């Protein structure tokens, strides 16, 4: 369905956010 | 329909915020 | 309509987004 | 109604990524 | 209700969103 | 349901928000 459709591309929003934060500790870290 | 069109604009918001990830890598 | 209203303010979102990467590379250069 | 809400938080998610993207472009130019 | 925690919670990913662009200002 | 789904994932979303202006307090120190 399309609620579910929408909760998934949130999802892989997250994912992609948590990939940011990810690669912003490493500049962090030199 | 319309809930189709909110989870299309979804995917691309994604795919952005994968850009900006990949390019976070460059600095 | 409202679920309309939603759809283009997501859109506008994702346009952000696009320019937000365009400056990171623009920085990385 | 609750629908228009949401619509009016999204706005206010997209003025924020327009300021993200202002302060990077300042970033950008030194 | 449920749309009104959605709400809630875009409401929290606006505040987060204008903490960033006030921390880049500091770079 | 799925609508509860859709907030959970928000919280998702806004808590790596939040992981992101933490880092880039710290890159500008």
Avoid: H, R, V
């Avoid at 369905?1 to 990939?19: D, F, N, S, T, Y």
């Amino acid at each position: 369905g399309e609620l579910k459709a929408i909760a998934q591309e949130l999802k892989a929003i997250a994912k992609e956010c948590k990939a940011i934060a990810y690669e912003l500790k490493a500049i962090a870290q030199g």
